[PDB]
Amino acid sequence: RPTLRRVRISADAMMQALLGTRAKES
Amino acid sequence: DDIYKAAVEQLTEEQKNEFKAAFDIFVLGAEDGCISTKELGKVMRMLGQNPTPEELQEMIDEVDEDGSGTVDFDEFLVMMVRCMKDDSKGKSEEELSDLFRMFDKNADGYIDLDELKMMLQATGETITEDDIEELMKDGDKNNDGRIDYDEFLEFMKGVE
Amino acid sequence: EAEKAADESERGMKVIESRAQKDEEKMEIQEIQLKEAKHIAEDADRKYEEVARKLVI
Amino acid sequence: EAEKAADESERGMKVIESRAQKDEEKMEIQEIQLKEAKHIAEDADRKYEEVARKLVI
Amino acid sequence: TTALVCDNGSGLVKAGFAGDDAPRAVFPSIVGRPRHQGVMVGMGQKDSYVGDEAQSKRGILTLKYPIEHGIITNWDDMEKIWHHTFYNELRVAPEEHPTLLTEAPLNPKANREKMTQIMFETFNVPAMYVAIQAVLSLYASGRTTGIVLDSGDGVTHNVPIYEGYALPHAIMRLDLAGRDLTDYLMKILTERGYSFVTTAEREIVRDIKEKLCYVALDFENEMATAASSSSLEKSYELPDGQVITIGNERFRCPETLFQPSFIGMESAGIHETTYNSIMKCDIDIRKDLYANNVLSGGTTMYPGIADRMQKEITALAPSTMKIKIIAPPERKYSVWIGGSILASLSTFQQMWISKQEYDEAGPSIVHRKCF
């Protein structure tokens, strides 16, 4: 039985969400 | 896996220095000099993404073979690019299965390494006998002297 | 009028300074306990992982 | 003279009260984080003890 | 496209796209109208707060669950809950996504037919399929046999399965579940002085039950110990202060599961309805069911239940058989993980109830071949 993951959302979006306002270049 | 190793080998010092600066900016104040499994998971939860701690353990086992839970530069970039899993579905299954079945030109149910040798001669990529030997070891799990069809699925599993 | 205003200003400054020092102490102790708890959590997670692997074996 | 003194005291009082209120809010956030850390620590401790007992059995 | 694996449940609605590990949005299923008058003008006060929003304004609301025991008693509120789930917690219009609801065994037909009629007429989904809540929990464990005890919050049901062939004559559905345990805990707390009456304070009692209660390995010894020492009294801080101390109410609340005579129910506990469900099966598959007993559902998360249940069944069962109780750490979302796995299968892709089929046979299509 294979497993599918949608938890791994786009990594650029993850970087943006973490850096918050300071997410300007990354 | 080594897929991300190939992806970062495709990448250059631009990505290296970009992620180095990202470390300097966000991991600033951390006493680690790397990124830990727990630190990465907690930071992800802080931003909103909530992967499982079992995924943290899996990723740390993958990139950090020593089990330290940290990320050496190469394995650090591998772990960082592991988050964005754009390429999935591993190419095609049945058509590639037919290609591998016809690869057994002798049609004995056995894939000789010399057929692989001829096909690689066609490819001509920079490879020595030890390199193809190591690749077959990665493929010939049961060490039956051939490329097993189930092992053909295994080594091409997820491979685009 | 000025006398009354000065008295009220002095009292307000006193109470605000007291509350500010209380807040600084609370922030310091909160940070200390927070860091200690996070380290304990890391230790517990590591122990859990190790014992789980041994249990599977 | 008294008017000038009163106005200066008023401005100092307002700015110090504002800074105290902001630091108090951040202290409340820190306390919330500490509570979450406490919960995580307790849950992980229960995990570890349960797994160890099962391994012994 | 991707399928929507919704799971109505009773107490927590769990939803998310098919193929993931955990539900995307989990929130209580309560709809609470305000009850006081309201004097501020222009505050933007709505007429009904649903989902997790009504767990923050619960001080001035009258929360009421739209699902009593598996069955749905208030269809307008359930429609509101579904609308919220689709549009605000997932933000995907249902016009472009198949749905996979879940339903308890032995439920009234009209409930299921109304559910499919709503999904096809109001939300206008492309295709929906209804699955029994226990088969999914068996999917998630990666087994293919085993008898699964899915003690949810509404209803506890016990479906035995062998080699993929369900045994319809051995399903034992019992209506004791988490909600009755909450009510019984709220009723025995009054023996110390703490009175919780309002429908909002039921949530506080639920939190007490989740955080403090545990299942005793042996009931009489615990009752004797708690009556002599004071090593059990754990305290808890209400939403306003005034900490409370729970004594032997800790293991008496979840003990109702194994002795339903506490809340006046006649039937036998969850330790004996499993053995009865096994004994109704054929004589040759009892060993496999004994060895693969599966736990699921929220209420089976009490600390120390996987040992009490094993001790009880070992007492009942023959001495030679091995009794093993599968209690995965991801118990709460086991049904939804199984639902995701089932919706992600290629073999299952032609079992959906397509809309044209519903247009030709009406809502009674669900009882037909497309089960």
Ligand SMILES: Nc1ncnc2c1ncn2[C@@H]1O[C@H](COP(=O)(O)OP(=O)(O)O)[C@@H](O)[C@H]1O
């Ligand atoms: N950690 C826990 N410990 C004890 N009881 C719990 C815990 N989590 C949930 N519960 C109980 O289980 C119920 C949730 O059950 P759930 O599986 O969500 O029901 P459903 O099958 O309707 O989804 C809650 O009402 C609560 O009483």
Ligand SMILES: [Ca+2]
């Ligand atoms: Ca060959």
Ligand SMILES: [Mg+2]
């Ligand atoms: Mg359920």
